[PDB]
Amino acid sequence: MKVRASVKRICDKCKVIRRHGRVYVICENPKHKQRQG
Amino acid sequence: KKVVAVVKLQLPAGKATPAPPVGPALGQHGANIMEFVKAFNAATANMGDAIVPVEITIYADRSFTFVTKTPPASYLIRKAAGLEKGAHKPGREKVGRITWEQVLEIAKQKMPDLNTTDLEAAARMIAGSARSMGVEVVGA
Amino acid sequence: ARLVGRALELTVGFSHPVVVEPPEGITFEVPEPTRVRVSGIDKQKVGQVAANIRAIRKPSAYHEKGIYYAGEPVRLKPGKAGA
Amino acid sequence: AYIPGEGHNLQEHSVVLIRGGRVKDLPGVRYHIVRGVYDAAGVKDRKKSRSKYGTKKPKEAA
Amino acid sequence: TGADLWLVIRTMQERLGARPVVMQLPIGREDTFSGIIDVLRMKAYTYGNDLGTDIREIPIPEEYLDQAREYHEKLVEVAADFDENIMLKYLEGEEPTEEELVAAIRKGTIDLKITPVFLGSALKNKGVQLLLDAVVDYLPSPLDIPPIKGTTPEGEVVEIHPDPNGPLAALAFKIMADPYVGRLTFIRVYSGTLTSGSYVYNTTKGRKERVARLLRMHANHREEVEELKAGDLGAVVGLKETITGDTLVGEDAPRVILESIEVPEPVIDVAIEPKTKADQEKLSQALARLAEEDPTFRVSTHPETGQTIISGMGELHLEIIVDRLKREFKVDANVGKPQVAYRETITKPVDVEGKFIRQTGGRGQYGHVKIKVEPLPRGSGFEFVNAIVGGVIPKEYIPAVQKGIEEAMQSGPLIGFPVVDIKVTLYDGSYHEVDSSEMAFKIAGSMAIKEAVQKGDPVILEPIMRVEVTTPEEYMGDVIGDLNARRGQILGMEPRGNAQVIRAFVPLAEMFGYATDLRSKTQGRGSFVMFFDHYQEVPKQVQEKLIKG
RNA sequence: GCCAGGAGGUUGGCUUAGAAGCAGCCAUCCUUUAAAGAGUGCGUAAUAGCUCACUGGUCGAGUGGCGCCGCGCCGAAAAUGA
């Protein structure tokens, strides 16, 4: 779920970074694909 | 060229129906558990039936050679304490009666099973397992 | 994964083959047209070029097909998912 | 159009051959069904009106 | 691309369990192909090109020759499982000449356990005449074909010998339309001989029909033959009746029959009412053209409400008929989901005041029934007792004083459907020996039921169906998927021969056209049996929208 | 991070078509053990299985986290040229 004003880490596999100046949510699973949108 | 297949399963007493892993490991063999409903049901002539493991082999040629074992611990509370099938919540509704007594011979028949392969230990384990099925162990 | 010429010439299901030159600091090396190695004295050209090749051809897509570094072919269920 | 009475078979076709003749019922009744035609084919166990109510022949065999 | 040999071999005994035993080996994979090596006559064969206007027996350019040996020995060695001379002959090292090889692969073949997997390529004429000669070398004739099962005029087993000197028995199968000779039948005879101009005899609906011109489809032309042969087939003209797969006897051929239990089974049902219904009987006779040039499907007429119901095996079967539907019939069809046989009930015990304060134009006419009603478990039935507190409500208020009940049952208040699962139990009344004709009090029974259900709880019961699911495990995984997705549950499972089968509950409304669904949920490896059972309620909110009145 | 252990009564009692740490209800053992829980997520038709948790092998110095406060980052689209 890309682009939501709230973003998080759902399971113990999802970890947040910083890229280009925007906050990004990673996790090997792309169904959790989140971004500060 | 099926070298070895001493494959094992969980075959209770009187269920001759070879499907996986009896299909692609013991059917990929020629393991006759017909000999299981014939040389193991007759073997367990104790009462009649019980859930008991098995272990047949195909020896490169195309042979058969097996070993059987022992019946469960939830059976020893059921056909004993008067716990018809199950007590529904082993914490709240204690049905049967297994005090410090009975449980002795109970754990006795089942010694090379269990864990500490003895009988001067697992008595309180089987008598603590009573609460897994929730049977009021009277203070003997 | 033909190595014809100095170039790496591959045909990965696309309607035509693919032509890769070996630029500076790098050669290729195809032990067999089933797996492809590249020679290079530079960590950038490693990841970047190999990447560019796997980007010539995408991996898996549900089932299994394409190019991979040496990773895992995670799948998406076959005869379903298409309602 | 009626039928030869007593147990049908026809659901929605049959090509019943429009026959003919009323009766003091079914404000019409005329143009009867046949029991033979392209369906119906009589009543099994009709040891009588073979000429109409279907039945080839009560062949006992046994 | 991706040609093979091996994988085929594997997949035979990895899908069914059938031993191939082979005959020849290729000369190159995809586009590496040039000709063919064989392991029978052991001859390095090879054509030349696509159209192959040039072929030759040029030597093996090496590479693969040796492999043949290993491979080829199997043939010989497989001939140790069926032959007689080959146990010792293989134990030796003495060559089995070309003569018993033929006879041995032919042996297992006609005996059904051997498979000269000759192969090739069609468009580029490479693999052709080789397979032709393969066909002769290992394909029999009715001579090798076992006693054809048929029946006697009595009802006992009979063998249909080729007998071009005895009985004159026959079958047909294909009904080809043809503006020249007229309605044509592709026939496989069996026994006797049939002269161009001879008669025959219907062997199910007796009709000493006429044969006129025996003619075989001779590639382009159609060879007109005077006589047709004992086993050989063809098209015979005439047979103005004569349907599909039906028994046909010659004038002699003492009125026998032929078996062929041959049956197909439907799985996809759809329903249709086209245009302003003015097209119905049109497509009726059109249907008469359907299942008579080829049986296939059914036109089963809805047992309850309107509409016909068109069902049959396949899928795009029904929809290619649909293609030819608005073709040679011209009919604006709207074939969609079928109806749902609906029956409803209640859920509580209520007493009602079946009061009927009435004097009318005369003859009394009223019925004060203190009725009590109750229901019954899903699919039980309908029962009652007199519930007479002495004799309050006299005799002639028995043969039909109910029926006001039974009648009103036919249309339960809400959406109007038969009301099963009930069990009555009156308890009181109030009458007069004049103010209570049979009629009157029975109609009071009617009011009783209607307001009883009105104030006794609403609920319909969507028709439920039991079903097998004949499926190889894997995609039983998948089908438990879609089945538990289809508002229902399964309840049953056992491993069968090849596969495994699920005893199933499903809701019909959520079960329509599942044979097409199953197809790719499984790749298609079995289906089911449309086994009716009973019915349950559509959890209020499903029923809700379905409450339209 | 890296090696390895990652056990037994048991397939916990019930539900439940099957519920076996593992869709839910209650659970609230004890035993061999350096340590392996009646389970962290994932995986099944239930099963299998991946993994973790946990202790020791390597390694050899700092680490895991809980709040407060100063400033920002996202949250944050409009009509002629900023």
Coordinates of all heavy atoms in Angstrom, one line a residue, chain E residues 64-138:
Chain E
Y64 N 25.6 -40.0 -32.7 CA 24.5 -40.6 -31.9 C 24.3 -42.1 -32.2 O 23.6 -42.8 -31.4 CB 23.2 -39.8 -32.2 CG 23.2 -38.4 -31.8 CD1 22.7 -37.4 -32.7 CD2 23.8 -38.0 -30.6 CE1 22.8 -36.1 -32.3 CE2 23.8 -36.6 -30.2 CZ 23.3 -35.7 -31.1 OH 23.4 -34.3 -30.8
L65 N 24.9 -42.6 -33.3 CA 24.8 -44.0 -33.7 C 25.0 -45.0 -32.5 O 24.1 -45.7 -32.2 CB 25.8 -44.3 -34.7 CG 26.0 -45.8 -35.1 CD1 24.7 -46.3 -35.7 CD2 27.2 -46.0 -36.0
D66 N 26.1 -44.9 -31.8 CA 26.4 -45.7 -30.7 C 25.2 -45.8 -29.6 O 24.9 -46.8 -29.2 CB 27.7 -45.3 -30.0 CG 28.1 -46.1 -28.8 OD1 27.5 -45.9 -27.7 OD2 28.9 -47.0 -28.9
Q67 N 24.7 -44.6 -29.3 CA 23.6 -44.5 -28.3 C 22.5 -45.5 -28.7 O 22.0 -46.2 -27.8 CB 23.1 -43.1 -28.2 CG 22.4 -42.8 -26.8 CD 22.0 -41.3 -26.6 OE1 21.8 -40.6 -27.6 NE2 22.0 -40.9 -25.4
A68 N 22.2 -45.6 -30.0 CA 21.1 -46.4 -30.4 C 21.3 -47.8 -29.8 O 20.3 -48.3 -29.2 CB 21.1 -46.5 -31.9
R69 N 22.5 -48.4 -29.9 CA 22.7 -49.7 -29.3 C 22.0 -49.9 -28.0 O 21.1 -50.6 -27.9 CB 24.2 -50.0 -29.2 CG 25.1 -49.8 -30.4 CD 24.8 -50.8 -31.5 NE 23.5 -50.5 -32.1 CZ 23.2 -49.5 -32.9 NH1 24.0 -48.5 -33.1 NH2 21.9 -49.3 -33.4
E70 N 22.5 -49.1 -27.0 CA 22.0 -49.2 -25.7 C 20.5 -49.1 -25.7 O 19.8 -50.1 -25.5 CB 22.5 -48.0 -24.8 CG 24.0 -48.0 -24.7 CD 24.6 -46.6 -24.2 OE1 24.0 -46.0 -23.3 OE2 25.7 -46.2 -24.7
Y71 N 20.0 -48.0 -26.2 CA 18.5 -47.8 -26.4 C 17.9 -49.0 -27.1 O 17.0 -49.6 -26.6 CB 18.3 -46.5 -27.3 CG 18.0 -45.2 -26.5 CD1 18.9 -44.1 -26.6 CD2 17.0 -45.2 -25.6 CE1 18.6 -43.0 -25.9 CE2 16.7 -44.0 -24.8 CZ 17.6 -42.9 -25.0 OH 17.3 -41.8 -24.3
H72 N 18.4 -49.4 -28.3 CA 17.8 -50.3 -29.1 C 17.7 -51.7 -28.4 O 16.7 -52.4 -28.6 CB 18.5 -50.5 -30.4 CG 18.1 -51.8 -31.1 ND1 16.7 -52.1 -31.3 CD2 18.8 -52.8 -31.7 CE1 16.7 -53.2 -32.0 NE2 17.9 -53.7 -32.2
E73 N 18.7 -52.0 -27.6 CA 18.7 -53.3 -26.9 C 17.4 -53.5 -26.1 O 16.8 -54.6 -26.1 CB 19.9 -53.5 -26.0 CG 21.2 -53.5 -26.8 CD 21.2 -54.3 -28.1 OE1 20.8 -53.7 -29.1 OE2 21.5 -55.5 -28.0
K74 N 16.9 -52.4 -25.6 CA 15.6 -52.4 -24.8 C 14.5 -53.2 -25.7 O 13.9 -54.1 -25.1 CB 15.1 -51.0 -24.5 CG 15.8 -50.4 -23.3 CD 15.6 -51.4 -22.1 CE 16.4 -50.8 -20.9 NZ 15.9 -49.5 -20.5
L75 N 14.4 -52.8 -26.9 CA 13.4 -53.4 -27.8 C 13.6 -54.9 -27.7 O 12.6 -55.6 -27.2 CB 13.7 -52.9 -29.3 CG 12.6 -53.1 -30.3 CD1 13.0 -52.4 -31.6 CD2 12.2 -54.6 -30.6
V76 N 14.7 -55.4 -28.1 CA 15.0 -56.8 -28.0 C 14.7 -57.3 -26.6 O 14.0 -58.3 -26.4 CB 16.5 -57.1 -28.3 CG1 16.8 -58.6 -28.3 CG2 16.9 -56.4 -29.6
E77 N 15.2 -56.6 -25.6 CA 15.0 -57.1 -24.2 C 13.6 -57.0 -23.7 O 13.1 -57.8 -22.9 CB 16.0 -56.3 -23.3 CG 17.4 -56.4 -23.6 CD 18.4 -55.8 -22.6 OE1 18.5 -56.3 -21.4 OE2 19.0 -54.8 -22.9
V78 N 12.8 -56.0 -24.3 CA 11.4 -55.9 -24.0 C 10.7 -57.1 -24.6 O 9.7 -57.6 -24.1 CB 10.8 -54.6 -24.4 CG1 9.3 -54.6 -24.2 CG2 11.4 -53.4 -23.7
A79 N 11.2 -57.6 -25.7 CA 10.7 -58.8 -26.3 C 10.9 -60.0 -25.5 O 10.6 -61.1 -25.9 CB 11.2 -59.0 -27.7
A80 N 11.6 -59.9 -24.3 CA 11.7 -61.0 -23.4 C 10.5 -61.0 -22.4 O 10.4 -61.9 -21.6 CB 13.0 -60.9 -22.6
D81 N 9.6 -60.1 -22.5 CA 8.5 -60.0 -21.6 C 7.2 -60.5 -22.3 O 6.2 -60.8 -21.6 CB 8.2 -58.5 -21.2 CG 7.3 -58.4 -20.0 OD1 7.4 -59.2 -19.1 OD2 6.5 -57.4 -19.9
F82 N 7.3 -60.7 -23.6 CA 6.1 -61.1 -24.3 C 6.3 -62.3 -25.2 O 5.5 -63.2 -25.4 CB 5.5 -60.0 -25.2 CG 4.5 -59.1 -24.4 CD1 4.5 -57.8 -24.4 CD2 3.5 -59.7 -23.6 CE1 3.6 -57.0 -23.7 CE2 2.6 -59.0 -23.0 CZ 2.6 -57.6 -23.0
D83 N 7.5 -62.4 -25.9 CA 7.8 -63.5 -26.9 C 8.0 -64.8 -26.3 O 7.3 -65.3 -25.3 CB 9.0 -63.1 -27.7 CG 8.8 -61.9 -28.6 OD1 8.7 -60.8 -28.0 OD2 8.7 -62.1 -29.8
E84 N 9.0 -65.5 -26.8 CA 9.3 -66.9 -26.4 C 10.7 -67.2 -26.8 O 11.5 -67.7 -25.9 CB 8.3 -67.9 -27.0 CG 8.2 -68.0 -28.6 CD 7.7 -66.7 -29.3 OE1 6.5 -66.4 -29.1 OE2 8.5 -66.1 -30.0
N85 N 11.1 -67.0 -28.0 CA 12.5 -67.2 -28.5 C 13.5 -66.2 -27.9 O 14.7 -66.5 -27.9 CB 12.6 -67.2 -30.0 CG 12.0 -68.5 -30.6 OD1 11.1 -69.1 -30.1 ND2 12.5 -68.9 -31.8
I86 N 13.0 -65.1 -27.4 CA 13.8 -64.0 -27.0 C 14.4 -64.0 -25.6 O 15.3 -63.3 -25.3 CB 13.1 -62.7 -27.3 CG1 12.6 -62.7 -28.7 CG2 13.9 -61.4 -27.0 CD1 13.7 -62.8 -29.8
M87 N 13.8 -64.8 -24.7 CA 14.4 -65.1 -23.4 C 15.8 -65.6 -23.7 O 16.8 -65.0 -23.4 CB 13.6 -66.0 -22.6 CG 12.1 -65.7 -22.6 SD 11.1 -66.6 -21.4 CE 9.5 -65.9 -21.6
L88 N 15.9 -66.8 -24.3 CA 17.2 -67.4 -24.7 C 17.9 -66.6 -25.7 O 19.1 -66.5 -25.6 CB 16.9 -68.8 -25.2 CG 16.8 -69.9 -24.2 CD1 16.9 -71.3 -24.8 CD2 17.8 -69.7 -23.1
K89 N 17.2 -66.0 -26.7 CA 17.9 -65.2 -27.8 C 18.6 -64.0 -27.2 O 19.7 -63.7 -27.8 CB 17.0 -64.9 -28.9 CG 17.6 -64.7 -30.2 CD 16.7 -64.3 -31.3 CE 17.3 -64.6 -32.7 NZ 17.7 -66.0 -32.9
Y90 N 18.1 -63.3 -26.2 CA 18.8 -62.2 -25.6 C 19.8 -62.8 -24.6 O 20.9 -62.1 -24.4 CB 17.9 -61.2 -24.8 CG 18.7 -60.2 -24.2 CD1 19.4 -59.3 -24.9 CD2 18.8 -60.1 -22.8 CE1 20.2 -58.3 -24.3 CE2 19.6 -59.1 -22.1 CZ 20.3 -58.2 -22.9 OH 21.1 -57.3 -22.3
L91 N 19.5 -63.9 -23.9 CA 20.5 -64.5 -23.0 C 21.8 -64.8 -23.8 O 22.9 -64.8 -23.3 CB 20.0 -65.7 -22.3 CG 19.4 -65.5 -20.9 CD1 18.8 -64.1 -20.7 CD2 18.3 -66.6 -20.6
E92 N 21.6 -65.1 -25.1 CA 22.7 -65.3 -26.1 C 23.4 -64.0 -26.5 O 24.1 -63.4 -25.6 CB 22.1 -66.0 -27.3 CG 21.5 -67.4 -27.2 CD 20.4 -67.6 -28.2 OE1 20.3 -66.9 -29.3 OE2 19.6 -68.6 -28.0
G93 N 23.2 -63.7 -27.7 CA 23.9 -62.6 -28.4 C 23.7 -62.8 -29.9 O 24.5 -62.2 -30.7
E94 N 22.7 -63.6 -30.2 CA 22.3 -63.9 -31.6 C 21.2 -63.0 -32.1 O 20.2 -62.9 -31.4 CB 21.9 -65.3 -31.7 CG 21.7 -65.8 -33.1 CD 21.2 -67.3 -33.2 OE1 20.4 -67.6 -32.4 OE2 21.7 -68.0 -34.1
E95 N 21.5 -62.3 -33.2 CA 20.6 -61.2 -33.7 C 19.2 -61.7 -34.0 O 19.0 -62.6 -34.8 CB 21.2 -60.5 -34.9 CG 20.4 -59.2 -35.3 CD 20.5 -59.0 -36.8 OE1 21.0 -59.9 -37.5 OE2 20.0 -58.0 -37.2
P96 N 18.2 -61.1 -33.3 CA 16.8 -61.3 -33.7 C 16.4 -60.5 -35.0 O 16.3 -59.3 -34.9 CB 16.0 -60.6 -32.5 CG 17.0 -60.5 -31.4 CD 18.3 -60.3 -32.1
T97 N 16.3 -61.2 -36.1 CA 16.1 -60.6 -37.4 C 14.8 -59.8 -37.5 O 13.9 -59.9 -36.6 CB 16.1 -61.6 -38.5 OG1 15.6 -61.0 -39.7 CG2 15.2 -62.8 -38.2
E98 N 14.6 -59.0 -38.5 CA 13.5 -58.1 -38.6 C 12.1 -58.7 -38.6 O 11.1 -58.0 -38.4 CB 13.6 -57.3 -39.9 CG 12.7 -56.0 -40.0 CD 12.5 -55.6 -41.5 OE1 13.4 -55.4 -42.2 OE2 11.3 -55.5 -41.8
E99 N 12.0 -60.0 -38.6 CA 10.7 -60.7 -38.8 C 9.9 -60.9 -37.5 O 8.7 -60.7 -37.5 CB 10.9 -62.0 -39.6 CG 12.3 -62.1 -40.3 CD 12.5 -61.1 -41.4 OE1 11.6 -60.3 -41.7 OE2 13.6 -61.1 -41.9
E100 N 10.6 -61.3 -36.4 CA 9.8 -61.4 -35.2 C 9.8 -60.2 -34.4 O 9.1 -60.1 -33.3 CB 10.4 -62.6 -34.3 CG 11.8 -62.3 -33.8 CD 12.9 -62.7 -34.7 OE1 12.7 -62.8 -35.9 OE2 14.1 -63.0 -34.2
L101 N 10.6 -59.2 -34.8 CA 10.6 -57.9 -34.1 C 9.2 -57.2 -34.4 O 8.5 -56.9 -33.5 CB 11.6 -56.9 -34.7 CG 13.1 -57.4 -34.8 CD1 14.0 -56.3 -35.4 CD2 13.6 -57.8 -33.4
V102 N 8.9 -57.1 -35.7 CA 7.6 -56.7 -36.2 C 6.5 -57.5 -35.4 O 5.7 -56.8 -34.7 CB 7.4 -57.1 -37.7 CG1 6.0 -56.8 -38.1 CG2 8.4 -56.3 -38.5
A103 N 6.6 -58.8 -35.4 CA 5.6 -59.6 -34.7 C 5.5 -59.4 -33.2 O 4.5 -59.7 -32.6 CB 5.9 -61.1 -35.0
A104 N 6.6 -58.9 -32.6 CA 6.6 -58.8 -31.2 C 6.1 -57.5 -30.6 O 5.3 -57.4 -29.7 CB 8.0 -59.0 -30.6
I105 N 6.5 -56.4 -31.3 CA 6.0 -55.1 -31.0 C 4.5 -55.0 -31.3 O 3.7 -54.5 -30.6 CB 6.7 -53.9 -31.6 CG1 8.1 -53.8 -31.0 CG2 6.0 -52.6 -31.5 CD1 9.2 -53.3 -32.0
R106 N 4.2 -55.7 -32.5 CA 2.8 -55.9 -32.9 C 2.0 -56.7 -31.9 O 0.9 -56.4 -31.6 CB 2.8 -56.6 -34.3 CG 1.5 -56.5 -35.1 CD 1.8 -56.9 -36.5 NE 0.6 -57.0 -37.3 CZ 0.1 -55.9 -37.8 NH1 0.6 -54.7 -37.7 NH2 -1.0 -56.0 -38.6
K107 N 2.7 -57.7 -31.4 CA 2.2 -58.5 -30.3 C 1.7 -57.7 -29.1 O 0.5 -57.5 -29.0 CB 3.2 -59.6 -29.8 CG 2.8 -61.0 -30.1 CD 2.8 -61.8 -28.8 CE 2.5 -63.3 -29.1 NZ 2.3 -64.1 -27.8
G108 N 2.7 -57.1 -28.4 CA 2.3 -56.3 -27.3 C 1.3 -55.2 -27.6 O 0.5 -54.8 -26.7
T109 N 1.4 -54.6 -28.8 CA 0.5 -53.6 -29.2 C -0.9 -54.0 -29.3 O -1.8 -53.5 -28.6 CB 0.9 -53.1 -30.6 OG1 2.2 -52.5 -30.6 CG2 -0.1 -52.1 -31.2
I110 N -1.2 -55.0 -30.1 CA -2.6 -55.5 -30.2 C -3.0 -56.1 -28.8 O -4.2 -56.1 -28.5 CB -2.7 -56.6 -31.3 CG1 -2.1 -56.1 -32.6 CG2 -4.2 -57.0 -31.5 CD1 -2.1 -57.1 -33.7
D111 N -2.0 -56.6 -28.0 CA -2.3 -57.1 -26.7 C -2.4 -56.0 -25.7 O -2.7 -56.2 -24.5 CB -1.2 -58.1 -26.3 CG -1.2 -59.4 -27.2 OD1 -1.4 -59.2 -28.4 OD2 -0.9 -60.5 -26.6
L112 N -1.9 -54.8 -26.1 CA -2.1 -53.5 -25.4 C -1.0 -53.1 -24.4 O -1.3 -52.3 -23.5 CB -3.5 -53.5 -24.7 CG -4.7 -52.8 -25.4 CD1 -5.3 -53.7 -26.5 CD2 -5.8 -52.5 -24.4
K113 N 0.2 -53.6 -24.6 CA 1.3 -53.2 -23.6 C 2.7 -53.0 -24.3 O 3.6 -53.7 -24.0 CB 1.4 -54.3 -22.6 CG 0.2 -55.1 -22.3 CD -0.7 -54.5 -21.3 CE -2.2 -54.7 -21.6 NZ -2.6 -56.1 -21.7
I114 N 2.8 -51.9 -25.1 CA 4.0 -51.6 -25.9 C 3.8 -50.4 -26.7 O 2.6 -50.2 -27.1 CB 4.3 -52.8 -26.9 CG1 5.6 -53.6 -26.4 CG2 4.5 -52.4 -28.3 CD1 5.8 -54.9 -27.2
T115 N 4.7 -49.5 -27.0 CA 4.3 -48.3 -27.7 C 5.3 -47.7 -28.7 O 6.0 -46.7 -28.3 CB 3.6 -47.2 -26.8 OG1 2.6 -47.8 -26.0 CG2 3.0 -46.2 -27.7
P116 N 5.4 -48.2 -29.9 CA 6.3 -47.7 -30.9 C 6.1 -46.2 -31.1 O 5.4 -45.7 -31.9 CB 5.8 -48.4 -32.2 CG 4.5 -49.1 -31.8 CD 4.6 -49.3 -30.4
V117 N 6.7 -45.5 -30.1 CA 6.7 -44.1 -30.1 C 7.5 -43.6 -31.3 O 8.6 -43.1 -31.1 CB 7.1 -43.4 -28.8 CG1 5.9 -43.3 -27.9 CG2 8.2 -44.1 -28.2
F118 N 7.0 -43.8 -32.5 CA 7.4 -43.1 -33.7 C 6.8 -41.7 -33.5 O 5.6 -41.6 -33.0 CB 6.8 -43.7 -34.9 CG 7.4 -45.0 -35.3 CD1 6.9 -46.2 -34.9 CD2 8.5 -45.0 -36.1 CE1 7.5 -47.4 -35.2 CE2 9.1 -46.2 -36.5 CZ 8.6 -47.4 -36.1
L119 N 7.5 -40.8 -34.0 CA 7.3 -39.3 -33.9 C 7.8 -38.6 -35.2 O 8.2 -39.3 -36.1 CB 8.1 -38.8 -32.7 CG 9.6 -39.1 -32.4 CD1 9.6 -40.3 -31.5 CD2 10.5 -39.4 -33.7
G120 N 7.7 -37.3 -35.2 CA 8.2 -36.5 -36.4 C 7.9 -35.0 -36.5 O 7.7 -34.4 -35.4
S121 N 7.8 -34.5 -37.7 CA 7.3 -33.1 -37.9 C 6.4 -33.0 -39.2 O 6.8 -33.6 -40.2 CB 8.5 -32.1 -38.0 OG 8.0 -30.8 -38.0
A122 N 5.3 -32.3 -39.1 CA 4.3 -32.3 -40.2 C 4.5 -31.3 -41.3 O 4.7 -31.7 -42.4 CB 2.9 -32.1 -39.6
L123 N 4.5 -30.0 -41.0 CA 4.6 -29.0 -42.0 C 5.9 -29.1 -42.9 O 5.8 -29.2 -44.1 CB 4.6 -27.6 -41.3 CG 4.3 -26.4 -42.3 CD1 2.8 -26.5 -42.8 CD2 4.6 -25.1 -41.7
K124 N 7.1 -29.2 -42.2 CA 8.2 -29.6 -42.9 C 8.2 -31.1 -43.1 O 8.5 -31.8 -42.2 CB 9.5 -29.2 -42.2 CG 9.9 -27.7 -42.3 CD 11.4 -27.5 -42.2 CE 11.8 -26.1 -42.6 NZ 13.3 -25.9 -42.6
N125 N 7.8 -31.6 -44.3 CA 7.6 -33.0 -44.5 C 8.8 -33.9 -44.1 O 9.6 -34.3 -44.9 CB 7.2 -33.2 -46.0 CG 6.0 -32.4 -46.5 OD1 5.7 -31.4 -45.9 ND2 5.4 -32.9 -47.6
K126 N 8.9 -34.1 -42.8 CA 9.9 -34.9 -42.2 C 9.4 -35.7 -41.0 O 9.2 -35.2 -39.9 CB 11.0 -33.9 -41.7 CG 11.8 -33.2 -42.8 CD 12.7 -32.1 -42.1 CE 13.8 -31.7 -43.1 NZ 14.8 -30.7 -42.5
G127 N 9.1 -37.0 -41.2 CA 8.5 -37.8 -40.2 C 7.3 -38.6 -40.8 O 6.7 -39.3 -40.1
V128 N 7.1 -38.4 -42.1 CA 5.8 -38.8 -42.7 C 5.7 -40.3 -43.0 O 5.1 -41.1 -42.2 CB 5.6 -38.1 -44.0 CG1 4.1 -37.9 -44.3 CG2 6.3 -36.7 -44.0
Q129 N 6.1 -40.7 -44.2 CA 6.0 -42.0 -44.7 C 6.5 -43.1 -43.7 O 6.1 -44.2 -43.7 CB 6.6 -42.2 -46.1 CG 5.9 -41.5 -47.2 CD 6.3 -40.0 -47.5 OE1 5.6 -39.1 -47.0 NE2 7.3 -39.8 -48.2
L130 N 7.5 -42.6 -43.0 CA 8.0 -43.5 -41.9 C 6.9 -43.9 -40.9 O 6.8 -45.0 -40.6 CB 9.1 -42.7 -41.1 CG 10.3 -43.5 -40.7 CD1 11.4 -42.7 -40.1 CD2 10.0 -44.6 -39.7
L131 N 6.1 -42.9 -40.5 CA 5.0 -43.2 -39.6 C 3.9 -44.0 -40.3 O 3.2 -44.7 -39.7 CB 4.4 -41.9 -38.9 CG 3.3 -42.3 -38.0 CD1 3.8 -43.2 -36.8 CD2 2.5 -41.1 -37.5
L132 N 3.8 -43.7 -41.6 CA 2.8 -44.5 -42.4 C 3.2 -46.0 -42.3 O 2.3 -46.8 -41.8 CB 2.9 -44.1 -43.9 CG 1.9 -44.5 -44.9 CD1 2.1 -43.6 -46.2 CD2 1.8 -46.0 -45.3
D133 N 4.4 -46.3 -42.6 CA 4.9 -47.7 -42.6 C 4.9 -48.2 -41.1 O 4.8 -49.4 -40.9 CB 6.2 -47.8 -43.3 CG 6.1 -47.4 -44.7 OD1 5.4 -48.1 -45.5 OD2 6.7 -46.4 -45.1
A134 N 5.0 -47.3 -40.1 CA 4.9 -47.7 -38.7 C 3.4 -48.2 -38.5 O 3.2 -49.2 -37.9 CB 5.2 -46.5 -37.8
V135 N 2.5 -47.4 -39.0 CA 1.1 -47.8 -38.9 C 0.8 -49.2 -39.4 O 0.2 -50.0 -38.8 CB 0.1 -46.8 -39.7 CG1 -1.3 -47.4 -39.8 CG2 0.0 -45.5 -39.0
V136 N 1.3 -49.5 -40.7 CA 1.1 -50.8 -41.1 C 1.8 -51.8 -40.2 O 1.2 -52.8 -39.7 CB 1.5 -51.1 -42.6 CG1 2.7 -50.4 -43.0 CG2 1.7 -52.6 -42.8
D137 N 3.1 -51.6 -39.9 CA 3.9 -52.5 -39.2 C 3.3 -52.9 -37.8 O 3.4 -54.1 -37.4 CB 5.3 -52.1 -39.0 CG 6.3 -53.0 -39.7 OD1 6.0 -53.6 -40.7 OD2 7.4 -53.2 -39.1
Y138 N 2.6 -52.0 -37.2 CA 2.0 -52.3 -35.9 C 0.5 -52.0 -35.6 O 0.0 -52.2 -34.5 CB 2.9 -51.7 -34.8 CG 4.4 -52.1 -34.9 CD1 5.3 -51.1 -35.2 CD2 4.8 -53.4 -34.8 CE1 6.7 -51.4 -35.4 CE2 6.1 -53.7 -34.9 CZ 7.0 -52.7 -35.2 OH 8.4 -53.1 -35.4

